[PDB]
Scaffold this motif. Structure first.
Motif, PDB file in Angstrom:
ATOM      1  N   UNK A  77      37.789  56.585  29.599  1.00 56.32           N
ATOM      2  CA  UNK A  77      37.419  55.192  29.414  1.00 56.32           C
ATOM      3  C   UNK A  77      37.823  54.403  30.647  1.00 56.32           C
TER       4      UNK A  77
ATOM      5  N   UNK B 110      32.716  40.330  29.878  1.00 57.28           N
ATOM      6  CA  UNK B 110      32.809  38.927  29.515  1.00 57.28           C
ATOM      7  C   UNK B 110      33.879  38.275  30.371  1.00 57.28           C
ATOM      8  N   UNK B 111      33.647  37.016  30.726  1.00 56.96           N
ATOM      9  CA  UNK B 111      34.518  36.300  31.643  1.00 56.96           C
ATOM     10  C   UNK B 111      34.294  34.809  31.453  1.00 56.96           C
ATOM     11  N   UNK B 112      35.134  34.014  32.107  1.00 57.48           N
ATOM     12  CA  UNK B 112      35.099  32.573  31.930  1.00 57.48           C
ATOM     13  C   UNK B 112      34.146  31.926  32.929  1.00 57.48           C
TER      14      UNK B 112
ATOM     15  N   UNK C  71      30.945  50.009  25.685  1.00 62.27           N
ATOM     16  CA  UNK C  71      31.097  49.612  24.287  1.00 62.27           C
ATOM     17  C   UNK C  71      31.492  48.149  24.170  1.00 62.27           C
ATOM     18  N   UNK C  72      32.627  47.769  24.747  1.00 63.19           N
ATOM     19  CA  UNK C  72      33.012  46.366  24.783  1.00 63.19           C
ATOM     20  C   UNK C  72      32.319  45.698  25.956  1.00 63.19           C
TER      21      UNK C  72
ATOM     22  N   UNK D 292      37.453  41.108  30.937  1.00 66.14           N
ATOM     23  CA  UNK D 292      37.579  42.068  29.856  1.00 66.14           C
ATOM     24  C   UNK D 292      36.319  42.915  29.780  1.00 66.14           C
TER      25      UNK D 292
ATOM     26  N   UNK E 234      41.794  38.637  34.358  1.00 66.23           N
ATOM     27  CA  UNK E 234      41.093  37.673  33.528  1.00 66.23           C
ATOM     28  C   UNK E 234      39.763  38.186  33.001  1.00 66.23           C
TER      29      UNK E 234
END
Lengths: 59, 252, 252, 59, 252
Positions: free
Chosen positions: E180, E221-223, E217-218, E110, E108
């Motif tokens: 990566x 992020x999470x809920x 780079x990215x 990213x 879950x």
């Protein structure tokens, strides 16, 4: 067609264990069912289908 | 992959998709009794299709606070078809088994079961100089339940998980043929169990051959939206069952 | 694994990672017309790179209450490049196809599509003795939509999902070359479709060869935080297309 | 450099189907892009780079 | 599958289950110095078990707003056992390395890390005609941190992620041996790095051989219910380490 002499049996389905689902996932789901014949299957006597019902012609 | 396993015994088939492996006893696969180890003199009864097939026991619900379950196994199949009838009409029985336990979850549930198959699990009592009634050691296909603390009921087994009802350390209970049901990798646990006894054949009511035990080490846990009801379903199939000494029906 | 599939037709490539298999028609792969089955006498036109390539239709949105969609397919590619131009300048056309349908979700979404490829799907009308306009049987790359109940519009197809617009049982509609898009295993559905008609070549405006149908049996469903917009994207590539009888542009 | 005679084309990217995401997972995500040359690639005429801009020396 | 990788160097073992591959330098595997490329005349010191083994650096926490980290690597292993002691007692050192970086998440989360291994990363200063103190280029096993904007501290490196502290484009920084850490497929990133220098042996305090860089780079992020603390753990093992010119302990 139905008669008492050649009765075939009952298909039934039961819960072995429940449906365990994680959080934020829907609980109620859907089973689809299929039927077909095997490679040893047969039919013997022709007759008319009990489904065709017409009254007049198709003008 | 080797995670898909299929088992056919009679007119019953189990297909699993997240299995692990199959523990086979102490290396021995169940076979019939030879003429060198035989004791009785008359012809046995080998049904082999009407008997050797999977019987499904009761499903039990696993809350967050559940402690464990046990089933006695020549006795939980008392009222399961022609195995139970052939148990009731004969005097000497001899069989192996195949114990398959189902429990499913999702990738958001966690937990871990321990499926042990314990031969000669002679259990203790709640009160030390007291007699245990037969309705508490076994109940047929309905499971008995361990307790988390020292239980002191009347005519009952001492139900404490850290002694397994037998007076040993429950962590040391992995010497028996066992598997784990880990909810991140497993879905099921297959245990093939041969006949282990001091005599070649024995009566299937007066004796308890072994005891299945399912004890959760890692407790069941989930979030505030996941599914609460998680069953545990046990299915058993006798193997190489044969019978000796036919007489009238009863047990007394 | 065999779940990764790659398809190259011309200057267009589709790489999928959760495919299932490829249904090829009734076993026949699309090939050119031989000289034994040929009827017309003049030389055909075989472009083979400017024609045989993937064309991407419109994406349609799948709500929880969507019922189905259909596209007529010698007619939805009317305005798609040199296939459509070679359709407009010739009189006789003959081609096979390759229908690839994309729809993606996560492991938290559920649902199930049925992708059927139905030859000669002569559809009914909403009013029984009424004529259907051509804008409702087909609309080009814009999809028409089934309805859940008995639709009674003017000059329109009878749009009911349990009869598929054709008057049959929709469960019996799996006799045609079909796949499923199940959102727990699939991501896409590839259908290779040869030329099926009663004549060796036919005009590609006056005739509708077949009809793609996408009908959701298990309805789309998700939780209170998952993504709502789920598109369905159809991509088609003619195969072994050849053309006969060149004349001026038009259709009348 | 840019001229009208040798123009090469347009690289574009479109939504085939949407991004379907389950519950309790973030919706907006990130694509990264890469470029390189193939095994049939060539360059011919030397010149100075249009990027180097100095005015005085580097004391 | 080839996603499981196991590495044993000395008395330390790393088993990973979601690895990708192993980048080995510029194709060259670390080996000892031959007699044709040798310059000094005396016998080297090859410990090979007390030295060539995995050393675990500090774990760093990756928030949503983290920008990057760097470690200088003949210098971050100053106080790591007999590698650091053999660095302090000898004058000439020569070794290759193996850089393994751990970072785990769930399905879950990213995000995407870039693990670069940059030889001769001579960094700039915050103020142009100013001298950098040694506590800001390196700090041992404690990481330094990039900043998102133009940093203008005293005696410090220019910390901007879009120039990597070196004055180049950070997108062009993939010419070096890199991997990566993509959180939907990866779990770890193994980089085997041989000895790259203009001389056959060099002193391991006055010189910095290379610089590990981990740049997201990215962004992570999470809920609203997932786990917040996500560490990043770097483990390094010298390979083919040998030493020359024994004298007293110190560095001045």
């Amino acid at each position: 067609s139905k008669d008492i002499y050649t009765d075939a049996g009952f298909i039934t389905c039961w819960y072995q264990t429940s449906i365990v689902v994680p959080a934020e996932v829907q609980n109620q789901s859907v089973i689809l069912c299929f039927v077909s014949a095997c490679n040893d299957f047969s039919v013997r006597l022709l007759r008319d289908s009990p489904f065709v019902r017409q009254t007049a012609f198709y003008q | 992959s080797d995670r898909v396993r299929s088992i056919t015994l009679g007119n019953s088939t189990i297909t699993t998709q997240e299995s692990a492996n199959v523990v086979v006893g102490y290396g021995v696969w169940p076979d019939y009794l030879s003429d060198e180890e035989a004791t009785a003199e008359d012809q046995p009864t080998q049904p082999d299709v009407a008997t050797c097939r999977f019987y499904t026991l009761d499903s039990v619900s696993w809350m967050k606070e559940s402690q464990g379950w046990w089933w006695k196994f020549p006795d939980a199949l008392r009222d399961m078809g022609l195995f139970g009838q052939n148990m009731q009409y004969h005097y000497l029985g001899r069989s192996g088994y195949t114990i398959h336990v189902q429990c499913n979850a999702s990738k958001f549930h966690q937990g871990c079961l321990l499926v042990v198959c314990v031969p000669e699990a002679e259990m203790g009592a709640a009160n030390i100089n007291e007699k245990i009634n037969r309705e508490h050691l076994s109940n047929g296909e309905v499971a008995n339940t361990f307790s988390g603390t020292k239980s002191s009921n009347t005519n009952d087994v001492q139900q404490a998980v850290f002694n397994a009802g037998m007076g040993v350390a429950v962590g040391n209970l992995t010497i028996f043929p066992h598997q784990w049901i880990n909810l991140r990798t497993n879905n099921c646990a297959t245990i093939v169990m041969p006949y282990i006894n001091s005599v070649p054949m024995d009566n299937m009511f007066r004796h308890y051959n072994f005891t299945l035990m399912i004890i959760p080490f890692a407790k069941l846990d989930y979030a505030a939206g996941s599914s609460t009801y998680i069953p545990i379903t046990v299915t058993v199939a006798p193997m190489c069952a044969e019978y000796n000494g036919l007489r009238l029906a009863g047990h007394q």
